[PDB]
Design a binder for these strands. Structure first.
Ligand code: NA
Ligand code: NA
Ligand SMILES: [Zn+2]
Ligand SMILES: [Zn+2]
Ligand SMILES: [Zn+2]
Ligand SMILES: [Zn+2]
Lengths: 162, 162
DNA sequence: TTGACTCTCTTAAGAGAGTCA
DNA sequence: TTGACTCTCTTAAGAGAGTCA
């Protein structure tokens, strides 16, 4: 098994490589009618992506290192959390993009939480609009708002009460 | 089936059958420290379920009627909305349960919206805690709250800024 | 040891369609 | 015509593992 030192070395190699990705400045809603700025470190759209990186899906990548003749591989966003517990409350931990930008690999834009917590950030009003997440959101979620509901609750007869 | 009169016939027969389901009272959080009461009309746990109804999955059912000697079938929760557009902004319309109770078929607890809008109601603060859904929620979402994040954003070196 | 491809799987909100009696 | 079962698929947030040179 990899030692703590080997794991830290893996995290260091990842940061050095991701830190050289193109840095894109984005203006984003924060909630409460305010605007902020996020700086995303974005993996390239096509190969080559960077030392150790390869694409396994349309917006999925993996990071690979060979140690003592053995090949090790991790999801490209999971590396910052290799020294953390990998489950909580019986649920698997997942890399959760606070910037909602799948190509970004900035570890300051990622957290480590259940898939339900991860998903729910899509609808959060944001750090200046009422976010109650203990690890606070960086921006208002892209899907927050009144929605586009086609038809509401309704009945034709009188069989039902609310 | 095809004509307006036949579709109205399907909706009326469905309302009559579901109107005989057992009515179960559920007390629910509304947000803002307040509580309300909903009356769900719950499909039985095992067969028989009711005229026209059959189970295709653990929490999935279908309604079936024979019209013009042909069998027509729909998802158990879609029948109230058979006269509505079946898409919006190029996204499929889905039956969304405002009471978050899958066995419930009370049409006063259903709406018709994209799968993203549907999912997002799981994290809404509720009608007394700040819901902004244009078709308003009936309760606070079951997954609303601070979350259980294991690790927050972090870096080991000095290569990244927020 | 490394790059650039290939394939299938998980979750929880939702679906369509076939086999028998 | 009606009832009671069987199977796989969709979406968008996430994953693991094989092949070849
Ligand atoms: Na996310
Ligand atoms: Na729902
Ligand atoms: Zn980012
Ligand atoms: Zn938040
Ligand atoms: Zn209900
Ligand atoms: Zn709401």
């Amino acid at each position: 098994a990899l030692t703590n030192a080997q794991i830290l070395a893996v995290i260091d190699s990842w940061e050095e490589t991701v830190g050289q990705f193109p840095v894109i400045t984005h203006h984003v809603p924060l909630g409460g009618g305010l605007q902020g700025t996020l700086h995303c470190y974005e993996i390239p759209l096509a190969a080559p992506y960077g030392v150790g990186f390869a694409k396994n899906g349309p917006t999925r990548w993996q990071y690979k290192r060979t140690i003592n003749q053995v090949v090790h591989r991790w999801g490209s966003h999971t590396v910052p959390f290799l020294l953390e517990p990998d489950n909580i409350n019986g649920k698997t931990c997942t890399a959760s993009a606070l910037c909602h930008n799948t190509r970004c690999h900035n570890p300051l834009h990622l957290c480590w939480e259940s898939l339900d917590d991860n998903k729910g950030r899509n609808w959060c009003p944001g750090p200046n609009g009422g976010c109650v997440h203990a690890v606070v959101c960086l921006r208002q979620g892209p899907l927050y708002g009144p929605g586009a509901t086609v038809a509401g609750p309704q009945q034709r007869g009188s069989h039902f009460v609310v």
